[PDB]
Design a protein around this ligand. Structure first.
Ligand SMILES: *[C@@H]1O[C@H](CO)[C@@H](O)[C@H](O)[C@H]1NC(C)=O
Lengths: 75, 504, 132, 107, 75, 101, 132, 107
């Protein structure tokens, strides 16, 4: 029973304050930070991964974001 | 009146000749229109209401299981039947299980059985639908001048009174001339359609808690469906994600229900807007719209009125608003009748040098009674002020000193306009509304461009749009041929400004 | 002549199921929503449910959810009502009636009504008693 | 869900009198209201559809009115065939309810 | 009340079958597919984005995965 | 033997709510209710205007809160590698037709 | 019709606590500040305190600081007064009354008042006696 | 606070007489003054809000006036239902006090 649709993906950009934004516009940050605080070495894992893609010294951090941002949620 | 201390208010004028003041009506703020004539007017959107909602598929998140069933079968005799499975009130799944010796089944190896149980449930999610028709807007508006302490508190008689008015708007009857006996007609005609982009919006009531949801999200939720249904035992649809089947290492499969996911749908509801009294009458909070407002017929009621020479006295310490203007409630007895009263401001007198923004034009007093309280406001220039009230020698004056610089005014105005530019998107245009060429140009350019921005960058989240803007920046420095890298800078800055939204 | 007729009065066991028939006359059977309404001997009328003679569409109120079934019979132009798991309140008289613009298959009340909303063929009333 | 009070509970009058019954519901029933009268052991009597409309064959002795939430039925002149229990009932939102009744008696 | 920690990020690699794997090893796929079926044009959005990064014709699809895989969950 | 470490409540109930408004400038709300911990309270800056008391006006403050009664505790006990217990059964072949637990 | 009603007269122990109820009628319960005022049999009236039916806001005078508690009950539209640590002066009659523009939660007297400032529903008076 | 004297202490008059009560407070109470009359064992009688305003249902037999600090109530014509203890009380600054009383008697 995955209650899949996090409705924020269907925000109403309307003047009155929405349902639970108060914690929402921090919840994904606390998500990723909690997950990485629990799985630290995955940091240098992602590092060795990204440093091997892009080969730009500028897309490298982009693939770092890639990996560190697939890991938390879809896991 | 009615729009003071309600910051996110605005003031809009109209270049006189052809009253054409199309305001962007706000269910989360007020808007005051002024004119050299035509007593200054406010408008504030009280509530938004929906009359008729249709009962589209409901959801169940609290289920219960009972009378379980397994129906084992030998490794080779077909696979399990379990006449229980015959009914749909039961949910069943078929699983290959180990079947060995000393287990019956003279053969052995992988056999099969169908574990299942009854699906009884509670706490339905009534996800009704609404349509752009038989919805209902309800606003109230108020002209300035009289009515000490306007103050919605006793609104009941104030719509019966002259200074305030209550207006209902339907997509069937868009026009409404807000008529104020002695004041005017306040012609209004709005767009009861393009307010909240309806027809993609569902009214969900779960635990007598209501809100609005983008129907796409509502269609995408994987819980059991009532699916359209009416009375009769609810034949729930998909019936599977809720319950969970589990066998032993090889054998003896059972089922768990996973309880109720009420808080789960709450945390998944991270974008909806809550809504209240629902009855057959469902009310909801803010939602904007477009209202063509016409000063066809507004008489100022007392331009001929004399300036009765009683001494006027402040009562409350006229503090100012974020919009820089300042409201004062001045009481006085001493004279009688439907008085006109002076109210100007200066930097020096022996001139009285009437300067600055006069908001509450033609301030009117009603009757002979004692120290009537005469609420009103004015707006001073960027420096020290001398607000002057009464008439001459037995007048009353007062320091202000706005302390808000002219370039500062442009700062506040442009950041306000930019926040409008964001949240109202296209509708932020025609806000200051004359039918000028470049106005329709801005409307159209935002129409096509921001519609593409929608369809391309579909509902980009907070974090998403954040990092997208960041990498667009990083690329806006990298690429050659500024023509396109400047377009990277442009879209990235658009995204980052969108992330500077009301959230802060 | 437009007119409905019920079956005879009946007596059943508590917890049994009773089926009352309602036969139509004088009209095209597929053009009138059949409404069933109960009436306890001393009580007023309370609408039980509705069926469409065409397509066998059905609906009712929660006071009967899980016990009431309503079926069509296009041949003899009849509608059959079953009450299941009979209960001491069921001793009453039930009425069947033709209703309004039965276009497809529903109650359909946001559009118009009346003109014998459901009141031309109220028939005779089906007296049912539930005891031993 | 559509609580509808039908006043009074009972009445008794002489022949040739006007009588009026009221029914107010807790809901908005703009025009979806109807009126019957039934004897014991009878199918009810053709009175009123849409709370304002006389049916064919009904004597003009009866009339119905009311717009928003409360509605008035009236017998112009009482007659011996008017002994019955009168009922008012709504048509909308479909938990269809009726009134408990308004009973008559000749003097 | 974000029930943040989807415990699969702390799997027990142990012989007996875990809590709800049956739907779990498909739930993220149905997540992304549902989300994109609801927000289609985001496809070519991600396309124009990625085709402008990497500049490899091989990292391009990688940034396509990047975008199409940040969009569903963290939204 | 399992030890009774922290429990959890997921079914709560609220009652006897309380707001305790305060003027834009007189400090901020006290609400003696907040004194107890059986009540949960949070302090919020609210608008306070004219015709609202508070001769001043602007942003005032009040502390909304209510009693936190709860049910359905989650007994999350602890266990340790000692006073746990394994229990096996074993069987030699040969005799015992239909061994069969 | 706007009207307040108290509980019956009561007799308590010195040092005990007495709770008098005050139920409202004829108005929206969340729109009138409830004022409690004491009156010794031979003495005049002295205002005890005020509560708001909404949000349970409270205040009183120092003559009762530490003994007086005032609570709301939104369901039945009632307000409950407890006097603690009863004392020989407490033998009196106490009155509850609805008052003015109860907008949020307070006394709020710098703005206007009157129009039955607190005098429409003065109820009946709660006679309390404190002895053994 | 707020010390408010209510004069006289008592009075007694015949039916059909005018009577006036004074109350002066030590403070400025511009218009926040009110007036009651109460029997023993009664809820008091609707007299006066804002020291100048008659309430609906109150007989015009009563009137109230006064602006700055001292205020006058008046019964135009005495009647048997006027036996009570009359009270004046302020509304401002919130140590709300009342007068000790003005008592009546018919002759
Ligand atoms: C209160 O109501 C009166 C009418 O009874 C009206 O004159 C006055 O303006 C209202 N005051 C407020 C603050 O609404």
């Amino acid at each position: 029973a995955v209650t899949l649709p996090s409705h924020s993906t269907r925000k109403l950009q309307t003047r009155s304050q929405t349902w639970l934004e108060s914690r929402e516009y921090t919840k994904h940050l606390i998500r990723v930070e909690n997950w990485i605080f629990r799985n630290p070495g995955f940091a240098l894992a992602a590092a060795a991964i990204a440093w091997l893609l892009g080969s730009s010294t500028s897309q490298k951090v982009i693939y770092l974001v890639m990996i560190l941002l697939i890991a938390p949620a879809y896991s | 009146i009615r729009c003071i201390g309600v910051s996110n208010r605005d003031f809009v004028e109209g270049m006189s000749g052809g009253t054409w003041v199309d305001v962007v009506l706000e269910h989360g703020g007020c808007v005051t229109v002024m004119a050299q004539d035509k007593p200054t007017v406010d408008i504030e959107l009280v509530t938004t209401t929906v009359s008729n909602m249709a009962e589209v598929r409901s959801y169940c998140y609290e289920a219960s299981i009972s009378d379980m069933a397994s129906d084992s079968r030998c490794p080779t005799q077909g696979e399990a039947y379990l006449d229980k499975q015959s009914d749909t009130q039961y949910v069943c799944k078929r699983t290959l299980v180990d079947r060995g010796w000393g287990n019956g089944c003279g053969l052995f190896g992988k056999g099969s059985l169908v574990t299942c149980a009854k699906f009884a449930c509670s706490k339905k999610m009534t996800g009704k639908s609404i349509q752009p028709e038989n919805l209902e807007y309800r606003i109230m508006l108020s002209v300035h001048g009289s009515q000490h302490s306007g103050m919605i508190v006793n609104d009941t008689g104030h719509e019966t009174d002259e200074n305030r008015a209550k207006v209902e708007i339907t997509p069937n009857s868009p026009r409404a001339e807000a008529t104020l006996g002695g004041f005017g007609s306040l012609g209004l005609d709005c767009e009861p359609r393009t307010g909240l982009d309806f027809s993609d919006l569902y009214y969900l009531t779960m635990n007598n808690k209501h809100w609005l949801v983008h129907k796409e999200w509502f269609h995408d939720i994987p819980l059991p469906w009532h699916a359209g249904a009416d009375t009769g035992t609810p034949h729930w649809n998909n019936k599977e994600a809720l319950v969970e089947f589990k066998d032993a290492h090889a054998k003896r499969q059972t089922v768990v229900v996973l309880g109720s996911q009420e808080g789960a749908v709450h945390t998944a509801l991270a974008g909806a807007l809550e809504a209240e009294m629902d009855g057959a009458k469902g009310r909801l909070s803010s939602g904007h719209l477009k209202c063509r407002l016409k000063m066809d017929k507004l008489r100022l009621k007392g331009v001929s009125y004399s300036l009765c020479t009683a001494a006027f006295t402040f009562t409350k310490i006229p503090a100012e608003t974020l919009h820089g203007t300042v409201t004062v409630e001045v009481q006085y007895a001493g004279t009688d009748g439907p008085c006109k009263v002076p109210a100007q401001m200066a930097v020096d007198m022996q001139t009285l040098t009437p300067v600055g923004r006069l908001i509450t034009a033609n301030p009117v007093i009603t009757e002979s009674t004692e120290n009537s309280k005469m609420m009103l406001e004015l707006d001073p220039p960027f420096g020290d002020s001398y607000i002057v009230i009464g008439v001459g020698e037995k007048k009353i004056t007062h320091h202000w000193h706005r302390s808000g610089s002219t370039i500062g005014k442009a700062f506040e105005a442009t950041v306000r306009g930019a926040k409008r530019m964001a949240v109202l998107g296209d509708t932020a245009w025609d806000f200051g509304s004359v039918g000028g060429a470049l106005n329709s140009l801005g409307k159209g350019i935002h129409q096509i461009f921001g519609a593409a921005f929608k369809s391309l960058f579909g509902g980009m989240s907070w974090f998403s749009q954040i990092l997208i803007g960041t990498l667009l920046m990083w690329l806006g420095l990298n690429t050659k041929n500024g023509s396109i890298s400047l377009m990277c800078l442009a879209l990235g800055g658009v995204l980052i400004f969108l992330s500077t939204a009301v959230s802060a | 002549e437009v007119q409905l007729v019920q079956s005879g009065p009946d007596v059943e066991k508590p917890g049994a199921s009773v089926k009352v028939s309602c036969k139509a006359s004088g009209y095209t059977f597929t053009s009138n929503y059949i409404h069933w309404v109960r009436q306890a001997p001393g009580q007023g009328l309370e609408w039980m449910g509705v069926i469409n003679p065409r397509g066998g569409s059905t609906a009712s109120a929660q006071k009967f959810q899980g016990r009431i079934t309503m079926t069509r019979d296009t041949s003899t132009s009849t509608v059959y009502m079953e009450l299941s798991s009979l209960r001491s309140d069921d001793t009453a008289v039930y009425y069947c009636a033709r209703g309004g613009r039965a276009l497809f298959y529903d109650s359909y009340t946001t559009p118009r009504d009346g003109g014998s909303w459901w009141f031309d063929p109220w028939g005779q009333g089906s007296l049912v008693t539930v005891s031993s | 869900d559509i609580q509808l009070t039908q006043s009074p509970s009972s009445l008794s009058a002489s022949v040739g009198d006007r009588v009026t019954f009221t029914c107010q519901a807790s809901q908005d029933i703009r025009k979806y209201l109807n009126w019957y009268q039934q004897k014991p052991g009878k199918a009810p009597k053709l009175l009123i559809y849409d709370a304002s409309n006389l049916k064919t064959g009904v004597p003009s002795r009866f009339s119905g009115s009311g717009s928003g939430t409360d509605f008035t039925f009236t017998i112009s002149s009482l007659q011996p065939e008017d002994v019955a229990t009168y009922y008012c009932q709504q048509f909308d939102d479909l938990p269809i309810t009726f009134g408990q009744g308004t009973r008559l008696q000749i003097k």
